[model samples]
Target: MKGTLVGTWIKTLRDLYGNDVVDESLKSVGWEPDRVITPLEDIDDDEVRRIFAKVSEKTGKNVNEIWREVGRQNIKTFSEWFPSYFAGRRLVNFLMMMDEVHLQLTKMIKGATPARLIAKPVAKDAIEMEYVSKRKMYDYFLGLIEGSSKFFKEEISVEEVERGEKDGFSRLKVRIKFKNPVFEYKKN
Candidate 1:
């Protein structure tokens, strides 16, 4: 994971699980309690897993629950960190642009495999989104969508349409239905 994201996770973890839990989890992973991760740094995925595992042990919360909450809260962090992306963009625009944004943002990193977020309008009030990545963090993906809705003050219903592995990538397809109509038939 990139330090930018891992750092956000750490901050969110501390907020949700408390500083003591986060400090102890970091210690278990050999990271100093006060260690600060730089934006350009690369963190080992295994170390992240170990830290989360330790957090689950101490907090007695399911790992998935922790991840979901972190994912939801991370939207706030992302909003503050990169205001340009959120500026002037409604929920639909932001969600639709994610795939290209992910590619552009992560292109500079060597060996970085950012998740592919492909979303297309499937109906007047809904879009079909596909999450493809080697690291199958489906809960995080769903949580992010939930957070997006909350951030935009837009209500949405998400239904998982498909989930499985194909061509070496874990894929999750979901239908996101918005409370308001976002598209309309136009005259030719």
Candidate 2:
């Protein structure tokens, strides 16, 4: 993991929980509360996992649930940091464009692993997206999608199509349907 990404997570954790909770979690993982994480600094993924694990322990929350909340909160922080992506995009369009945006953004960093958000239209009013990554962050993925819907002021019904892990890769497929038709073109 990159320090920048980890730093963002820390900031969101602080924002969502509180200073004391974040500070104690960091301390439990032997991380300085005031340590500066530079944009280019490389951090071990295991260390990041350990930090989250400690935070989960301290908060008496499931690790996956914590991660999901963090992911949901990060959407706001990320949008604030990079507004261009969200500009002029509706929820469905933004979600559809995310697969490529992730690739482009990851290229800006060193040693970043990009996740694939393979999206395809399922109906005039719905879309199906498959999240493929080495990291099995299904709950986080779900949270982000929910956050996107909220951010865009859209009411969407989301269904988990499937999820699985194999050979070091994990995939989660979901069907997202809007109350109103999302695409302009109607299927014949």
Candidate 3:
């Protein structure tokens, strides 16, 4: 895992759970409570898992629940760090552009498994989005979508259509229904 995302996760964990939980989690992984992570520094996947597991043990929350909570809250940190992505956009726009953003962000890094987000307008008030990744992080993905709605103050309903593994990749398809119409039908 890249230190950049892991660093944000640490911050988000602290924000969501508490400083003590984060401190203990980091210490459990042999890292200092105030450890500074460089942007491109690499971290072992297993170490990251162990840190989160320790957090789960301390917080009494399931690891998946922790991930979902972190994903929902991480948007705030992301906005603070990269405001340009959220500027002049609605929730739908941001959600749709995430695939490209992921590609761009991980382009320089080798062995990065960037999530593939393919979204399309399926109705005037709905969109169908597919999430594909080597990492099975559907809960986090759904949480991010939910958080986007809250961040933009645009209420929405998301329903999972399907989820399974294909060709060594985990896939999730969801239909997101917005409270108001976000598209117009045109004769073409």
Candidate 4:
């Protein structure tokens, strides 16, 4: 994980729970109580996992839920960090462009983990998005989708078609259907 991710998790954790809870969680991970993270700095995923594990222990929340909450919150936080990605883009278009954004952002820093997101039209009002990465943040993906819908004031239903790990890779296939048609079909 990147330091920005870890830092945001800490900041949001503080925002959600409290400063003391985040402080204790950081202490459990043998980290400073107040640490600043650079966006380009690389951090160990295990450390992040351990921090969250400690947080879960303290907060009575599951790790998956925590990650999902972080994902949901990150939508707004990240949009502020990268406004062009969200500006003038509706729900469907924003989602469709995420694969490229993921690529671009990850490429900005060397050795940053990559999350593959590919959106393809499944129907006029629906799309199938495949997430392939070692980090099996499936709940996070779903939460982000939910958050995006809420942010854009668009209703959407999501289904997890498939999820599994093989050859050290995790894959999650999601189908997202919008309340209204995002694309029209004219037989050609």
- Give per-residue CA lDDT, model 2, range 1-188, as digits (tens): 66767778888888878888888877777889766677778888888888789778878999999988988888887788778888888888899898888787577764466779989988889999999989888888998888788788988998999999988789999999988876766556
Ranking by TM-score: 3, 1, 4, 2
Residue pairs in steric clash, candidate 1? none
* Clash count in backbone of candidate 4: 0
Q: What 10-residue stretch in candidate 3 is worst by lDDT?
A: 106-115
Task: Write model 3 residue lDDT over 111-164, tens digit each, in one string.
Answer: 766778989899999999999988888778888887788788888999999999
Candidate 1 residue lDDT tens string, 7-72: 888887887888999999999888999788978799999999999899989989898987888788
TM-score to native of every candidate shown: 0.93, 0.90, 0.94, 0.91
lDDT of 3 at 87: 88
Lowest lDDT 10-residue stretch of candidate 1:
105-114
Q: Give the whole-model CA lDDT for all candidates, comma-separated.
A: 0.89, 0.84, 0.87, 0.84
TM-score of 2: 0.90
lDDT of 4 by residue, 96-118 (tens): 99899888768876555677999
**What is residue 23's positional error in candidate 2, in angstroms?**
1.1
**What TM-score would you give candidate 1 relative to the actual structure?**
0.93
RMSD of 2: 2.2
Better of 1 and 3 by TM-score: 3
Residue 37 displacement in candidate 2 (angstroms): 2.3
For all candidates, the clash counts are 0, 0, 0, 0
